[PDB]
């Protein structure tokens, strides 16, 4: 929270956290210090009785490498928008894709989970993305309480140079063409919710030529999710079928993929919040003889102790169930277990 300005209908919210974090793992690419911090600003201005303008900015700053290292900070979110009361809201910039409106229900683990597992950042509309225009409608205007739907469009994010280039070029793993997404969530009963999400994007020419894995003109995602959040109990499950949209590590994309996440949590009155979860990502029809491969598969057990709204500490144990093989080695998929210890100050 930490509202630092609230004068003349203009509110400024300064949020962020400092996370002293350490990983223990046989994977040397993962083991070691993981300390980082986040800094953010939420701003809001009242234009008239029916119109409110807003903007948000979220910045990730790593603190686990030296003062001469490179690329230690990056923007997670940055968008400006207008809210027209019950009509809805629209914003554009770097924001979360609507697919995350459902898959975030399982992104509640102490440390692991979320982007970088079954889905990644800058991975079409599955997570945070560049240049997304998002329309959101709350409670179906004034009709149905708990019914939310969103419509989203994303412009092409092409290559660095060449015919498929845009001003903000990237590598094939983080490219996209013109695409759209839609999400729909409803609370059938108190504490129980169901959600659906769909996204369809054009694939770029470099995605079909540079990597060895993944061929197709369109990336598609079908997502369904459930949530129970009542009586100090949190239960969430999420199943997604992707087409030419799930990353197969360094090697490319999977032609088809089935991702599944499920998590169970309980919140004690004195602050402890133990958590158990299972995540898997099944790839199908891979090129170069890989065929059907496990991209992700692990069981997560951990807990978080909340001192208050500004301080917490946690332990997270990722029990990796992947078997080391040619695919995991060539794609760069980690198969070792990791234990995470964190102490977080939030503001």
Ligand X SMILES: CCCCCCCCCCCC[N+](C)(C)[O-]
Residue 182 contact among ligand C8E, ligand X, a copy of itself, none, beta carbon within 5 to 8 Å by kind: ligand C8E
Between 63 and 133, CB nearer to ligand C8E: 133
Q: Which of residues 116-175 bind ligand X (CB under 6 A)?
A: 170-174
Contact between 133 and ligand C8E by CB under 6 A: the answer reads: yes
Query: Which residue has the CB atom at the shortest distance from ligand X?
Result: 171
Least distance to ligand C8E from the beta carbon of 84, Å? Answer: 15
Residue 156 or 215: the one with the smaller Cβ distance to ligand C8E is 156
DSSP β-bridge partners for residue 148: 185
Could you tell me the smallest distance in angstroms from the CB atom of residue 205 to a copy of itself?
Answer: 12
**Nearest CA to 324 among 22, 109, 31, 26?**
26
User: From ligand C8E, a copy of itself, ligand X, none, which one binds at residue 91 (CB under 5 to 8 Å depending on kind)?
Assistant: a copy of itself
The answer to whether residues 64 and 32 touch, using CB atoms and an 8 Å cutoff, is yes
User: Which DSSP string corresponds to 108-119?
Assistant: -SSSS-SBTTTB
Least Å distance, CB 184 to ligand C8E, is: 4
User: Quick one: which of 101, 78, 75, 100 has its CA closest to 91?
Assistant: 78
Determine the Cα–Cα distance for residues 14 and 288; give it in Å rounded to an integer: 49
# chain residues binding a copy of itself, by CB under 8 A:
87
Give me the least distance between CB of 120 and ligand X, in Å please: 10
Residue 175, SS3 per DSSP: coil
Q: Specify which residues 253 forms β-bridges with.
A: 247
From residue 207, give the alpha-carbon distance in Å to each of 23, 188, 313. 33, 40, 41
Report the distance separating Cα 192 and Cα 197, nearest Å: 17
Interface residue with a copy of itself, options 85, 88, 155, 216 (CB under 8 A)? 155
Q: Interface with a copy of itself includes 79 (CB under 8 A)? A: yes
Q: How far is the CB of 36 from ligand X (least distance, A)?
A: 16
User: Of these, 8, 48, 49, 69, which contacts ligand X (CB under 6 A)?
Assistant: 69
CA distance 246 to 281: 9
Structure-block tokens of residue 324? 């080391």
Which of 96/317 has CB closer to ligand C8E? 317
Nearest alpha carbon to residue 246 among 258, 237, 234: 258
Residue 343 binds ligand C8E, judged by CB under 6 A: yes
87 binds a copy of itself (CB under 8 A): no
64 binding partner (options a copy of itself, ligand C8E, ligand X, none; Cβ < 5 to 8 Å by kind)? a copy of itself
Calculate the dihedral angle through the C-alpha atoms of 294, 299, 302, 304, rounding to the nearest 10 degrees.
60
Which of the 8 DSSP states describes residue 195?
Answer: E
SS (H, E, C) 124-137: CCCCEEEEEEEEEE
Q: Which of 87, 137, 174, 187 binds a copy of itself (CB under 8 A)?
A: 174
Question: Contact with ligand C8E (CB under 6 A): which of 87, 192, 262, 339?
Answer: 339
Nearest distance from C-beta of residue 176 to ligand X, angstroms:
11
Residue 126 tokens, joined: 């599955």
**Number of residues lying near ligand X (CB under 6 A):** 8
Interatomic CA distance for residues 15 and 153, integer angstroms: 28
- Cα–Cα distance for residue pair 33/318, rounded to 1 Å: 17
Q: Is 131 in the site for a copy of itself (CB under 8 A)?
A: yes
How near is the Cβ of 65 to ligand X at its closest, in Å? 6
Cα distance between residue 174 and residue 130, in whole Å: 10
Report in angstroms how near the CB of residue 113 gets to ligand X at its nearest. Answer: 21
Q: Which residues bind ligand C8E (CB under 6 A)?
A: 20, 22, 24-26, 31, 92, 133, 149, 153, 155, 178, 182, 184, 196-198, 222, 301-302, 315, 317, 339, 341-343
Summarize as ranges the residues that interact with ligand X (CB under 6 A): 66, 68-69, 170-174
């Amino acid at each position: 929270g930490a509202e630092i300005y609230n004068k003349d209908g203009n509110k400024l919210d300064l949020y962020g956290k400092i996370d002293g974090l350490h990983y223990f793992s046989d994977d040397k690419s993962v083991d070691g210090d993981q300390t980082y911090m986040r800094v953010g600003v939420k701003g809001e201005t009242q234009i008239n009785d029916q119109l409110t303008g807003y903007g948000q900015w979220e910045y990730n700053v790593q603190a686990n490498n030296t003062e001469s290292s490179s690329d230690q900070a990056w923007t997670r979110l940055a968008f400006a928008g207008l809210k027209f009361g019950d009509a809805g809201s629209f914003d554009y910039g770097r924001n979360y894709g609507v697919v995350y409106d459902v898959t975030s229900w399982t992104d509640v683990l102490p440390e692991f989970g979320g982007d970088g597992d079954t889905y990644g950042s800058d991975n079409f509309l599955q997570s945070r993305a560049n240049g997304v225009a998002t329309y959101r409608n709350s409670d179906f205007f004034g009709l149905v309480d708990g019914l939310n739907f969103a419509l989203q469009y994303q412009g092409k994010n092409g290559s660095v140079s060449g015919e498929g280039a845009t001003n903000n070029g990237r590598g094939w793993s983080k490219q996209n063409g013109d695409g759209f997404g839609t999400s729909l969530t409803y609370d059938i009963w108190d504490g129980i919710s169901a959600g659906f999400a769909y996204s369809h994007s054009k694939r770029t020419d470099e995605q079909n030529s540079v990597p060895a894995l993944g061929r197709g003109d369109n990336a598609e995602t079908y997502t369904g999710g459930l949530k129970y959040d009542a009586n100090n109990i949190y239960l969430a499950s999420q199943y997604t079928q992707t087409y030419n949209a799930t990353r197969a590590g360094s090697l490319g994309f999977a032609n088809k993929a089935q991702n599944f996440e499920v998590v169970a949590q309980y919140q004690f009155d004195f602050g402890l919040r133990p958590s158990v979860a299972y995540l898997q990502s099944k790839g199908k029809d891979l090129e170069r003889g890989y065929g059907d491969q496990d991209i992700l598969k692990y069981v997560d057990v951990g807990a978080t102790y909340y001192f208050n709204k500004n301080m917490s500490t946690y332990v997270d144990y990722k029990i990796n169930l992947l078997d080391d093989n040619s695919f995991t080695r060539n794609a760069g998929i980690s198969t070792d277990d990791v234990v995470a210890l964190g102490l977080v100050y939030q503001f």
